[PDB]
Design a protein around this ligand. Structure first.
Ligand SMILES: *[C@@H]1O[C@H](CO)[C@@H](O[C@@H]2O[C@H](CO)[C@@H](O)[C@H](O)[C@H]2NC(C)=O)[C@H](O)[C@H]1NC(C)=O
Lengths: 212, 150, 213, 213, 212, 100
């Protein structure tokens, strides 16, 4: 069957251009009975449609993305690319290239989908995570780790206190945040030891902070 | 580049005479989805001469483009636009879905299904007379066995 | 324009039949075909229904769909929920123009554990955060098995929605999600607004958890 | 595999117009040509509509073909019926794999004499027939003019499909058609089962008669 | 004009290979723009495509019985042959020759059909029929003649006194079953002496049976 | 002395253009033979192998070129062709399309 796979840089600074390539394997872009589209998917939001173009020259864009995207087909290389103008931090969606059938009466079904490439949008350098004491409000406390650009920065608790690892989330300022949840009993038997241990893989830096 | 085109029912025909046929400009308006020449060469266009030149233009579907050729049949060929068996020219077709398509339906372009016989090469068919398919005639208003020929 | 609306998630016990419907928009839904795409978490979408009646190769007969012009909506009647049928389902169609409008997403979760009410927790900003001139308060929600849940900061002045960062609800050891949120703002506005209390809407239930220093 | 389905029987009074249509299920109807072959009973078929719009020379202009892309079907309009137009019409097309696809066949006839309701003559096995260890259940249906000869077998509770040997429509000596619904059953099955049914369903009227020992 | 004509054995038996050949007149089989097909029509059913073959050797088959068909072409004698394999009792039908037009832009109608040949598949060679009475229940009653090998049927009612003899059909066992019937105005008329006699044409054997 | 066997795939209505002195898309811009060609031209229908139900797009033919190909010369260049009256910087776009 026809397969699609994307490749390109995963880190793009804002106000720059985004260039990705979609290799069509098992088929041919020479076929004039199919369109070649791009699909976005922000984390936890849903699917977003950019637009598709025909190998004959016709191109259709999203109404809300006028003068925002540019599509091109390379019939000699059997690939079609994607071009974005003035990217912003809100463009952290996963990009998918898909083929949709137009051979029938109406363009109906996206036949095949690309593998999907995660494209991050942030120009911040490898800054250190800022750890703040997140006191419990039976309650629960956390590490309260914020202001860190690198993704694989993880945390821990007492090096085996198990408490739940928390997934990351992006910020509008171009950074990430991670606030774990660790249960704690009342103050009678809940003030023994609670020390956050953020790994901070980049820069070979280790930070340890105590949590009330 | 007229920004307006007629249907195959009333295909336009332009007279080309007393002018220099500069064929070096047709490459600037269409990507040539179907550029097929029969009696002439694509490059020898600027090195030949002819008695009279006619440029016929119309709008048809994608599946009907293959019917614009010598010795072809179909609704567009046998009833809307017939080419002779020894036609010496070039056929140019390109997609117009970006310009000649309306979201509410572009019912302007029409085509004749069939009128009692096939057509002759290079002739018009503008008679909007009602088509009769049965033994009993009918005129004026359509109805059973009295269908519009378009 | 065109838009397909659908519930955020539906759930039913196994060996049953669900019916996911996507409502139309100002445009006529009977003009173009509507497709249904199943996308498991961490994978590309897969077509299960196309041309409003057809089933791709390999798709079992459990999936089905129809188009109701009187109701101006679509449908995805999935019978016999299985362990592999637990995924997100998106509905896509086309407007009168070349605009491939997608849906919102309905997470069909198979009932394997009894549903429970979530536990929401709110805590004011820390002292070191206030020293850095930033509130960045954090919410703590957990203990809700069936599906995810959205939050909305029902503040005393007006419901705050801009500048809100919500984490993707991820599974835990107790087969529960988290669905945490973040509302970063300057501390100078914290003294003039109290009791944010982002309310949940899980299973039609609302948990009121205010914030206090 | 592209297929073509057309009505089994079409009947209309002379000087009127009939319509025989074939719909493609597993594929498109506009990607390949559709042809109509008028096969007179007892002779080879003959092309009357080819290339979906063309009629051969010599064929009367009473025939005309049409293509419906919205419904994915191909129709045949015959206005002004005649006595020789009582032949069968076959709609044939091609699959994308270069496989010729033939229709199911449609029996067209003019309504010369008034239509009469069919008769049922359910006959149980005979004494010598039972001694021969055979059942041979037959339904010598008669008294029906239109060529809508249909046979639907049914047991007491279950349907019957094996042993159906319905013959072609044969005309009686009084200018009227009659057929036979043969059926071969194991005598053990005839002794175990309670009764059977021989549903005719001629021209929509589901004439049904059962037979029991 | 161009015309076709079938040629081959009109009666075969199972576990054999049905061999046929069509003699073409008015045209050369080596001519391109035309395929040479074989169409099957069982008695009482619609048409069935078997396969056409181009002169260049390209033979297209029907996916239903592709593994049990074979087509050849001979440019010298202008005859194309058909060869099936592992024939069954259900393969009996009327085979028609047909020339398809591959001239313009697509494959098209079978312009010229043959006269059609009717062949039957049966392993038996000689079998005497058996008569069975039919008791009525205006009434209908007759005779039941089954399991006769030859095709011609001889029906006689009341030694000639008259009838819609219900022509038999090739059943699953490869035989035929005659069910000629008559009508009576009432059950009292059924008590009269009525005779139903059949004659074995290839054997000159008469069968008598008293029915009432 | 030496025999060269050229092999390629074309359509049916293009087999006649392989003869010497012919004119057409295949003869001029794809495969040209001299006026004094010595040899035999062989062609057979391979529709059963070189065709796909969805369309076999692995075979290409050059549509327009700067000039007609010389006899027994090959042009494997896949560079985009300029045809408009204005430069296009050698990139695909308006007035500049693929040659194959
Ligand atoms: C001839 O073609 C040119 C360009 O292909 C047309 O010019 C464009 O016209 C549209 C609509 O009028 C404008 O939106 C564009 O901005 C124009 N582009 C340029 C470069 O001028 C022109 O309208 C066509 N017709 C005539 C009579 O010139």
């Amino acid at each position: 069957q026809v397969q699609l796979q994307e490749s390109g840089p995963g880190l793009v600074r804002p106000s720059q251009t985004l260039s990705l390539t979609c290799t069509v394997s098992g088929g041919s872009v020479r076929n004039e009975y199919y369109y070649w589209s791009w699909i976005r998917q922000p984390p936890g939001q849903g699917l977003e449609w950019i637009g598709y173009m025909h190998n004959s020259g016709n191109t259709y864009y999203n109404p809300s993305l006028k003068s925002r995207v540019a599509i091109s087909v390379d019939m000699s290389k059997n690939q079609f690319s994607l071009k974005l103008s003035s990217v912003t931090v809100a463009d952290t969606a996963v990009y998918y290239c898909a083929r949709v059938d137009v051979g029938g009466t109406l363009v109906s079904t996206f036949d095949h989908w690309g593998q999907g490439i995660l494209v991050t949008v942030s120009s911040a350098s490898t800054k250190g995570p800022s750890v703040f004491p997140l006191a419990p409000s039976t309650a629960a406390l956390g590490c309260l780790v914020k202001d860190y650009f690198p993704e694989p920065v993880t945390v821990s608790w007492n090096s085996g206190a198990l408490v739940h690892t928390f997934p990351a989330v992006l910020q509008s300022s171009g950074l990430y945040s991670l606030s774990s949840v660790v249960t704690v009993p009342s103050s009678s038997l809940g003030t023994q030891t609670y020390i956050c241990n953020v790994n901070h893989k980049p820069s070979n830096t280790k930070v340890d902070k105590r949590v009330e | 580049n007229a920004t307006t085109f007629a249907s195959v029912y009333a295909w336009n025909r332009k007279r080309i005479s007393n002018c220099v046929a500069d064929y070096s400009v047709i490459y600037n308006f269409a990507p040539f989805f179907a550029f097929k020449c029969y009696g002439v060469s694509p490059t020898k266009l600027n090195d030949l001469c002819f008695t009279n030149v006619y440029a016929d233009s119309f709008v048809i579907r994608g599946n009907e483009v293959s019917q614009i050729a010598p010795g072809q049949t179909g609704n567009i060929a046998d009833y809307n636009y017939k080419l002779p068996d020894d036609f010496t020219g070039c056929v140019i077709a390109w997609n117009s879905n970006k310009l000649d398509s309306k979201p509410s339906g572009n019912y302007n372009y029409l085509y004749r299904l069939l009128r009692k016989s096939k057509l002759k090469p290079f002739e018009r068919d503008i008679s909007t007379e009602i088509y009769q398919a049965g033994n009993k005639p009918c005129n004026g208003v359509a109805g059973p066995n009295c269908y519009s020929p378009l | 324009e065109f838009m397909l609306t659908q519930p955020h998630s539906v759930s039913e016990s196994p060996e049953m039949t669900v019916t996911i419907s996507c409502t139309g928009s100002s445009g006529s839904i009977a003009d173009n075909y509507v497709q249904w795409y199943q996308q498991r978490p961490g994978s590309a979408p897969t077509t299960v229904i196309y041309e409003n009646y057809q089933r791709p190769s390999g798709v079992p007969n459990r999936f089905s769909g129809s188009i109701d012009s009187s109701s101006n909506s679509a449908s995805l009647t999935i019978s016999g929920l299985k362990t592999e049928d637990e995924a997100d389902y998106y509905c896509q169609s086309y407007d009168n123009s070349n605009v491939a409008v997608f849906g919102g997403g309905t997470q069909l979760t198979v009932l394997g554990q009894p549903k429970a009410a979530p536990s929401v927790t709110l805590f004011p900003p820390s002292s070191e955060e206030l020293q850095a001139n930033k509130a960045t308060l954090v919410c703590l929600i957990s203990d809700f098995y069936p599906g995810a849940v959205t939050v909305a900061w029902k503040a005393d002045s007006s419901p705050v929605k801009a500048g809100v960062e919500t984490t993707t609800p991820s599974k835990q050891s107790n087969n529960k999600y988290a669905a945490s949120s973040y509302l970063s703002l300057t501390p100078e506005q914290w003294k003039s607004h109290r009791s944010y209390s982002c309310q949940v809407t899980h299973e039609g239930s609302t948990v009121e958890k205010t914030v206090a220093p």
